[model samples]
Target: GDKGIYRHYMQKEIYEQPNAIKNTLTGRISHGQVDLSELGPNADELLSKVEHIQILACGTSYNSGMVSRYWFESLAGIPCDVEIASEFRYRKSAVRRNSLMITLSQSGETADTLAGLRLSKELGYLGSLAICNVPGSSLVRESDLALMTNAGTEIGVASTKAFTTQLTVLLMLVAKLSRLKGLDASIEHDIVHGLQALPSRIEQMLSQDKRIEALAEDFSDKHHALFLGRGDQYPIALEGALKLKEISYIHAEAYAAGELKHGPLALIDADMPVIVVAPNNELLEKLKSNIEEVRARGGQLYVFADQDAGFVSSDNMHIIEMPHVEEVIAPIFYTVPLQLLAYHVALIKGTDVDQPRNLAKSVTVE
Candidate 1:
């Protein structure tokens, strides 16, 4: 829990991402493919029956599930749904045939999450799998299969490396299931290579911390903010918004870029700062139009876009350019900047970055 050279646990956790993510992939891939033997000897048989997915978690873990829904459905060709554990526990849930129950957690001891796992057994999920950072914890022991995230001992309440490591494990799982489901072998091959190079790019992304720290000054005085993204990045936006509110104590919300015009448009004004995660995905063109709507309404805008995205800084719009990455893993890279921004803003505001008021690193009691 010591901060060492870093000012806070969040800073150390943020910087640890490169190594944390690297550790998660160790021995998990070979010959341009992902291997999931670590889960268990029965993993092969268990995964073969998986035709649908129902992911359950809370807070940042829940956000990771949101990103994986896109992967499981599109890449793995399995119908997928994500639900907050607390909500799923109280509601009557109908399990689809052969639907895999996935419970994701950094601590693995989250109260609602554990309860959700307990209730799923009675509700008749085909099988259960836990993606958890903690080894031998409650969720892992309770589930039928478990994969470990090696983002060792995340101490920050806002969750930096834990989130990325969870994404890494999910990405590997997606590649495995995609290969099993007769997906193009070439696509799975590319994913393995992309993962092999992921840690270095994450290290490079950390270099922007100074600039992100400077960027925080602009928000230190602001009371509210909005984050927007499209597709998988929408969950990244939600995670970013969660970080800001948890650490900086700033009121923030995230919207799907396409949903901007539906209602959130009323909240747009010059005093409002809108942050957009615009990776060079297929939806970039549609997201750019959302940016136009924000600027047209006189809202100051900040965008984290890759060089290929062709965005320029203007009086009302500021662009932070990042290295372009493969579409499958772009969300993992884009997430670091948002974490740094929240860390810096919390520093500027003099809040407890590692131990924010009224928040716990692990919510063990519901």
Candidate 2:
């Protein structure tokens, strides 16, 4: 017999994430292998006519949108900004048709997001493109175009894998926009290759769950965890910390490793377990120094170091060495250990690992 819905949906969605990503990329890129037609048939026209992009989202989707900021400006050569739907709706902000409004919601019915869509439409934004999992929700119905994420039937309230799939979709959009603007073909191909490689990397990372489980015991009892990342990993850090708190009920916060001196270093101590996401990217050396700073302050560090990375080491740190991966796509690999860490931490704490309290598989409200 097959596994039940809970596990099936979880695993199916997990494996499905890659296809969701690939499909998203397929729609965005063309013959050069880069186009983003996933939103709908006329999405290219919509993207072509628009001069600016503004994203409105909340929670996990918002963090995914955070990464989109980098993807958009770099790939598409257009200025972009992401705002929380709640703040975008309740607070005053600029909105126009030359400005394309995009809202990300797993459940398209999210009240604040729907309101933000409506507000943008009324404010004369060119149109709204909604990236959602559910097909017929309010946000989908109200938007000009909709790109559906095939993370079918996510049951876990904490949202494993769905967030990554959303990022894949958004990145696809960026690639398509880049192609339309006639950007470099080589850069586009590299991104497509990166997208295709993501799931396998994630699978590789998932294979290390047992080790993550064993390591969970060391930090589960600790209060207030610190998650550090740099560059693109900054958003990864944000998503990582949120996952820790959502399911494990730990007070976890993410910081840009470079910004430790500005503040947050004050929280470092023996009792605070710091989790560092260090891949062998340009930022790894500086991130290593940041980890060292924390260790020097008597804080404990648990490092997930990619194999190819030359991350610094210390007796005070425990290392989880991951296989070397391309820096462009390393987030896909880096995410696995954190996902397992959250799963085990919640399990060890006797919290509901499958469904965390006060959270929903899809948050439909502000």
Candidate 3:
């Protein structure tokens, strides 16, 4: 509970990611495969009935839901729909047959998320599952099945370890669901090994904090930032922008890099800092052109890229080469630098790092 050498609780939580992830993975994975047997009796029966997933949450938890949609669909062949709890609770939406309700909340007491869970119970969901940090929280108590992230009493108002742990648990869920669908054993093995190696990979990412802090200096003078990414990285970009906005009080926005030509490309200029999470993958080539679009318009780019993201930095475009990591889990490791960047920039800007203006640790009220 002590802050120790860190300047704030936020920094401490950010640094705790490696160990926190290990805790989340501990009993859940063994021998290069996922074992979710802790989910209790009849868990497999309920999961077997699930054909669709509906995720609801607010703020940071909601962002994790966005990322999980890609995982659920691509990895498990489940069509997942994610939404803000307030909107979903209010709307009379049509529920698909055999849909499972999943709610993501770092704090188990988020009012809207709890309400959404309550509302879905009457909407014919096959079962309810809560991915939460606090074990005995209201949302957890209300859900039919609950998986604790074990991020350990996240104290920072802006979630750090809890967020990454959320992603970690969701990926594990993907592995379990994929296996249930009788998909390739090899893909799940890859996932298990990649997750097993994540803590060290995050340690590598944390080792570059000095570099990220120096990079934050560039952002200290900037007022607006535009974050860009594609595919899974797109949600990472969104979370990064939210981190910047929450702590640094910077007006930051994230866009799917492909959408640059559609609208936001015109905003690029000498004053705009374009932060891109360019993980090397299928969409890496398209991300390069987006980088080009920003650079050609005299926009400054700060990129956290994979070692082989194939693009180099020059002049106004600066690249922070992240350690080589598996493509699927790249977003988890890539988040470390982005978190550091926001934290250090907040320090430089002299804003309240842990307790920012007009925000609460948990949104308990509607």
Candidate 4:
């Protein structure tokens, strides 16, 4: 009933991604560096003491944590681990003495996530940081440091803009850490420039909604889907699959492309729709081979590829060209279509896109 020129909050939030990400970056980046002051006083001391990072969250926030593991280790050269908060809170695992605990949440009140962070303190976590959208909420108030996402109010039960904004802030955290690790200024400049242009680039991606809507028609009746990606994109594949199953109620799974032959390839057939997220990175050739693997098995393929990435569409396999972006940040760009795909597919199925069955916007209780 709160539809305001949009049928659902999910649709409004999907389209609000550009602005949400822009707000997350506003005044947070200067020149080619992230403003570390936002992490608060003693940040340098905490950064120096951090030998590892333990990230905790659930659902979409956990997926962001997965993506951040790649960013933190690859760019910052810091060992990082991601845990589902519910599992982490109950598990008996040794926390490194110099480990920094970071929790991601849009609501700042996920019960399991908050519980996990609270548990970290007793386990000897050196410091705690919260990457959250809600200011002054429980998670933010309890943490030693915090970075807030200005994503505004996300009314949808299923997250769209909030997820991307979290990625933006997490990317900034990695960039900041990379700089501290002596990454070159030119690379920092490129990253800063990349962040600045993301809003317009997301605009370009959103302009392809009509095309994504047409693509959604392919998924409406499908009972199963498999998403594929490699390297950093692998986490993106997981997030995409999560979005589809969360709203459209389509049973979906994601696989690291190289891992296909080991297990998931068996799921491929004429009945399965395989969605591959392929950007023009070093892993594209490996992903192409996986594409061929699916084709040989008669699996229908829906690929989102970078423009001019040299992929051609054929029968039972179609390509959606995404705008080119730096490989460091391409995962964020690839997220738009998947979100829209899920939204439109749910729209076609006449499901409640904003408030799906058996789910809540925020899991506030254990």
Candidates in order have lDDT scores of 0.88, 0.75, 0.88, 0.86
| Regions of model 1 farther than 4 Å from truth | 279-298
TM-score, structure 4 vs. true? 0.95
Tens digits of per-residue lDDT for model 1, 52-124: 8999999999999999999888887899999999999999877899989999999999999999999999987
The sequence of per-residue lDDT tens digits that candidate 3 reaches over residues 1-366 is 789998899999999999999999999987788889999978998898789999999999988899999989998999999999999989899989999999999989999999999999999999899999998899999999999999897888899999999999999999988988889987798789889889999999999989988988888988889998888888889999999999999989999877877988788876678887864545545555666776766787677777766667777667788778987798788888888999999999899987999889998886
Show the lowest summed lDDT stretch of 10 residues, model 2: 1-10
Candidate 2 residue 226 Cα shift, in angstroms, is 0.7
Residue 169 error, candidate 1, Å: 0.1
TM-scores, in order shown? Answer: 0.96, 0.90, 0.96, 0.95
- Which candidate wins on lDDT? 1
User: lDDT by residue for model 2 over 1-366, one digit each (tens)?
Assistant: 233553434444554555555554554445647544445677777788888899998788888888888778866788888898888898877655488889998878778888889888668888888898888989889888888876665666666667877877776677677777888866677777777787777777767768888999987897889898876777888888998898888899998877876888777887788777874455555555665776766776777887656555667666678877766676656766787787778777888766678877655644
Better of 2 and 4 by lDDT: 4
Name model 2 segments beyond 4 Å from true. Answer: 1-32, 38-41, 279-297, 363-366
| Local distance difference test, candidate 2 | 0.75
